[PDB]
Design a protein around this ligand. Structure first.
Ligand SMILES: O=C(Cc1ccc(O)cc1)Nc1ncc(-c2ccc(O)cc2)nc1Cc1ccccc1
Length: 306
């Protein structure tokens, strides 16, 4: 039985409070909502959320890192308070189209530090693969580290379901990932206002919820997965396994949820330091300060050493 953190309300940041601190910038035919700490712009730490979430995920993590480097946290296209995609498509490369276009307008330094979770990590990894000169370090967690060739025995049957018209009902009609999966993968009970911040972009039924269905349908299952995403992930996985000069931090979840394959995948990338914090999947909600402190020390060490 999950309980409220009795000390959390004293520092709670509501959706409105977070969004008030964000900025918007026109990108291609749409716009990106994002948080930008601005100061210390000689470095840039870009935090990338994944499915069901938004920049809001990082709200308690980022304060620890701001004093050492400019921190920048977007809402991916179609998610959070960002604009929608011009053609209503939300595949990995649609997200990547807007993300990379957005980067071009941020006055970034030559080498960028990424912090990625879930599909946000996939975006960071793909960016790194295509810009191998532009990466100072990578922090990742609960990340799409590799393809799936084989904890989740019926994964194929589940992905087959999510790819059927039942997936449309599960998500567009019934908001499966936001309203059911998200709270199940946080160890504490979220304050009502915190859950409301996650629900808000997806509060209405129908097509607005598309990004939360499109993400799982991108799953790089070797057997049945979209072959283009499978190849993207094979490509960046090979590159990461050879990236000895790229400092990395893997933040492992304890106990995690079916996370053994992620950890083993992560251990195939050289120059990775491993740390562990409490959580299931959305570990930012269970150990944000331990995460922030780990990320801060890592960044500091990377900037020294360099
Ligand atoms: O729990 C299930 C089984 C299931 C539940 C509801 C339903 O309508 C159909 C099947 N599957 C599952 N099993 C594990 C996880 C999961 C794994 C890792 C993680 O970090 C978070 C969730 N998520 C899920 C949910 C899911 C994902 C993708 C496609 C269909 C259903």
């Amino acid at each position: 039985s999950k309980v409220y953190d009795p000390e959390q309300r004293k520092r709670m940041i509501t959706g409105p409070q977070w969004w008030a601190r964000c900025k918007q910038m026109n990108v291609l035919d749409s716009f990106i909502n994002y948080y930008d700490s601005e100061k210390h712009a000689e470095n840039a730490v870009i935090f990338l959320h994944g499915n069901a979430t938004s920049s809001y995920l990082w709200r308690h993590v980022v304060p620890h890192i701001e004093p050492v480097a400019r921190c920048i946290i977007p809402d991916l296209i179609g998610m959070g308070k960002s604009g929608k995609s011009g053609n209503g498509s939300y595949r990995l490369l649609d997200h990547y189209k807007y993300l990379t276009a957005w980067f071009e307008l941020l006055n970034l330094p030559k080498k960028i530090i990424f912090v990625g979770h879930d599909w946000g990590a996939a975006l960071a990894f793909h960016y790194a693969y295509e810009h191998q000169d532009r990466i100072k370090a990578i922090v990742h967690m609960e990340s799409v580290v590799d393809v799936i060739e084989s904890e989740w025995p019926d994964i194929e049957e589940d992905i087959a379901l999510i790819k059927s018209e039942e997936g449309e009902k599960m998500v567009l009609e019934n908001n499966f990932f936001v309203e059911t999966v998200l709270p199940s993968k946080i160890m504490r009970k979220l304050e009502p206002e915190e859950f409301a911040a996650y629900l808000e972009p997806f509060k209405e039924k129908g097509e607005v919820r598309r990004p939360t269905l499109s993400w799982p349908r991108e799953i790089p299952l070797v057997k049945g997965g979209k072959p283009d995403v499978v190849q993207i992930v094979r490509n960046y996985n090979a590159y990461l396994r050879a990236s000895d000069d790229l400092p990395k931090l893997f933040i492992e979840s304890d106990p995690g949820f079916f996370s053994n394959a992620i950890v083993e995948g992560a251990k195939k990338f050289p120059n990775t330091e491993f740390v562990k914090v409490k959580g299931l999947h959305f570990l930012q909600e269970d150990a944000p300060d331990e995460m922030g402190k780990y990320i801060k020390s890592f960044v500091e060490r990377v900037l020294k050493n360099e």
